[PDB]
C-alpha cells in the first residue's frame, strides 16, 4: 500500500522555566519509531519501535546531533517569532514543524510535506513543488525571505526526495511484518434502548491498523451523516486503533440501519446490522 514518514517537532517556550523544550517524534504511517526530548535527563534519540533498534550507534548519534542542533535553532526561532509578532517576553509560545514524504503503493515518491505552525496556526509551508513557500502572514514572510535567501527550500527538497524516501523504504522493509501489515477491524453492533421509542445502535471497530478507517451508518441505504455520532479514532496502545459510530433509531426500525466499514485490512468492505 501507500506509506509515509513524518517527523513532528514541537518547540515550546516557557519564560521563567528554563529554555524552550524541543521534542521530535518520528512516524512511519501510524507507528511512532523514534523520540527526542530536550527535557530528558540525558537527551538522546531513543527508539520507540522494535524494528528501528537494529540501527547502529552511527544512526543514533546522527539523529541526536540533528535534534540537539535543532533544539538550539528552535530556541532562536522562538525568539525571532516573538519579535515578528511584537510579543512580550512573558508568554509561552510554540513552533511546530511537520514534515516528511509520501510513497505510493509502488514505493515511488508521491509528494513531500514540510509545514510549520506558530501557536497552532499555519505559519509557513513548503509548497508541493518543494521549491517555493506559502507564508501565512507578514511575520511568516520574514521567515520566507530569510529561507529564500538561504536557499532553504533546496535543502528541504533534497531531503524529501532523497534521504526521506530512502530511509522510509528502509524502515518499511525492516518493519515489513508490521508496517506493511494491515490489521482489519474486529466489528460488532451494540443495541441500547434510550427510551421506549428509541434505541442506540453503536457500530464498533476494534484492533485495526492503520488508523485510517471509514465507519458509517445508513438508514434504508442512505448515509446518516448528520444523525451519526462518530468518535475520534483512538489508539488502543497495542499499535491498533478503535472507533465507533452511533445512531439513535426508532424502536422497531433497527433493521433499516446498516453499518458500513471500510478499512485497508478488510478483504471486502463490511456491512453490519444489529443482530438481536
Amino acid at each position: 500500500g501507500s506509506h509515509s514518514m513524518r517527523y513532528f517537532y514541537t518547540a515550546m517556550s516557557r519564560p521563567g522555566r528554563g529554555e524552550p523544550r524541543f521534542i521530535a517524534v518520528g512516524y512511519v504511517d501510524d507507528t511512532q519509531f523514534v523520540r527526542f526530548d530536550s527535557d530528558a535527563a540525558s537527551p538522546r534519540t531513543e527508539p520507540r519501535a522494535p524494528w528501528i533498534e537494529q540501527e547502529g550507534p552511527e544512526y543514533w548519534d546522527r539523529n541526536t546531533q540533528i535534534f540537539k542542533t535543532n533544539t538550539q535553532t528552535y530556541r532562536e526561532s522562538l525568539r525571532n517569532l516573538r519579535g515578528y509578532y511584537n510579543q512580550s517576553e512573558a508568554g509561552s509560545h510554540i513552533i511546530q514543524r511537520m514534515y516528511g514524504c509520501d510513497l505510493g503503493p509502488d514505493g515511488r515518491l508521491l509528494r513531500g510535506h514540510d509545514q510549520s505552525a506558530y501557536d497552532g496556526k499555519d505559519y509557513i509551508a513548503l509548497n508541493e513543488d518543494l521549491s517555493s513557500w506559502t507564508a501565512a502572514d507578514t511575520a511568516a514572510q520574514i521567515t520566507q525571505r530569510k529561507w529564500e535567501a538561504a536557499r532553504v527550500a533546496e535543502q528541504r527538497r533534497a531531503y524529501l526526495e532523497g534521504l526521506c524516501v530512502e530511509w522510509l523504504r528502509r524502515y518499511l522493509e525492516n518493519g515489513k511484518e508490521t508496517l506493511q501489515r494491515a490489521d482489519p477491524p474486529k466489528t460488532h453492533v451494540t443495541h441500547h434502548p434510550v427510551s421506549d421509542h428509541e434505541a442506540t445502535l453503536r457500530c464498533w471497530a476494534l484492533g485495526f491498523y492503520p488508523a485510517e478507517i471509514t465507519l458509517t451508518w445508513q438508514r434504508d441505504g442512505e448515509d446518516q451523516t448528520q444523525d451519526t455520532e462518530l468518535v475520534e479514532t483512538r489508539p488502543a496502545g497495542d499499535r491498533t486503533f478503535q472507533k465507533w459510530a452511533a445512531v439513535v433509531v426508532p424502536s422497531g426500525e433497527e433493521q433499516r440501519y446498516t453499518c458500513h466499514v471500510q478499512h485497508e485490512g478488510l478483504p471486502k468492505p463490511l456491512t453490519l446490522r444489529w443482530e438481536p
Partner: peptide, 13 residues
Amino acid sequence: LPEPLPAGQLTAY
C-alpha cells in the same frame, strides 16, 4: 531519518 543538518548554518525561522 530526520532532515540532516545542512552544510553551513542551520537556518532559523
